[PDB]
């Protein structure tokens, strides 16, 4: 075309509507080729702004055939760095994921091959505060999906012991790296067995490794044990005049570390 006339601009509406009607009646190397021929160019803000949904819009109008070729092949870790990627947990204008979609709309195939997606968020809360079960109007899909979580606290929580058993700091920021993760987890659960929290234990331990990580991902100094003690209950007071002996040191800094931690605590108890 003539270097006179005006650059194309692009139409969100325009682009939705090839889109939609490309996701109802075409499979998955069909929608390729729409993207590398319409969503151009492709870092475009308006371009972007519908390709990130198109999990929303495939959840609406597609099959599950389709939706399970964008998953596998473009919202894995394995594309993350490609121009073909979709965020799985992707909200959309009103707070919702594809997942509380599929749930609003019985999708349970859908709602199946999302919960089994290892980044999935199903804690993500929409603008009505809702997470995605909630949107259930299926009690089937509801208690499968309350199941699945369920399931999937019961392995992370295990996978969460396994990284404190073996003091694995990259083990358990990998663990805490997933926003889902750091919901489902509760740092300060108490051990029936033994009344203790993590913190209570790795104190006891004189751990200072794994204390100063537990302090830092929401480790409470104000829990008691089944006892009704602190942590910092469980270090022996040392007179002034030998606080700072070498022999002292690592309850001394055990206790700093506690100290620190609950004037933390306390403002967060008020917030």
């Not at 606290?153 to 920021?173: G, M, P, S």
């Amino acid at each position: 075309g003539s270097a006179m006339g005006s650059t194309v601009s692009v139409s969100k509406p325009l682009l939705k509507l090839k889109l939609l009607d490309c996701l109802r009646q075409s499979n998955f190397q069909q929608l390729c080729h729409l993207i590398a021929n319409e969503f151009q160019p492709f870092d475009e803000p308006t371009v972007r702004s519908v390709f990130e949904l198109i999990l929303h819009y495939a959840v609406q109008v597609s099959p599950a055939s389709l939706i399970k070729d964008i998953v596998q092949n473009w919202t894995t870790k394995g594309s993350s760095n490609s121009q073909l990627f979709i965020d799985v947990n992707k909200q959309d204008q009103d707070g919702n994921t594809p997942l509380h979609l599929a749930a609003f709309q019985s999708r349970g195939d859908v709602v199946t091959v999302l919960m089994n997606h290892p980044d999935i968020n199903d804690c993500i809360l929409n603008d009505a505060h809702l997470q995605p079960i909630e949107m259930c109007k299926n009690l089937n899909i509801a208690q499968m999906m309350q199941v699945a979580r369920a399931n999937y606290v019961a392995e992370i929580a295990q996978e969460f012991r396994q990284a404190f058993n073996n003091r694995d700091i990259d083990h358990l920021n990998s663990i805490l790296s997933n926003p889902r993760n750091q919901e489902l987890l509760d740092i300060n659960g108490m051990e029936p067995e033994t009344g203790d929290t993590v913190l209570h234990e790795f104190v006891k331990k004189r751990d200072i490794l794994l204390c100063r990580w537990i302090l830092d991902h929401g480790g409470d100094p104000f829990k008691r044990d089944s006892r009704g003690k602190l942590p910092i209950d469980l270090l022996k007071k040392v007179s002034s005049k030998e606080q700072n002996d070498k022999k002292n040191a690592i309850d001394l800094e055990l206790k700093k570390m506690l100290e620190k931690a609950a004037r933390e605590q306390s403002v967060i108890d008020v917030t």
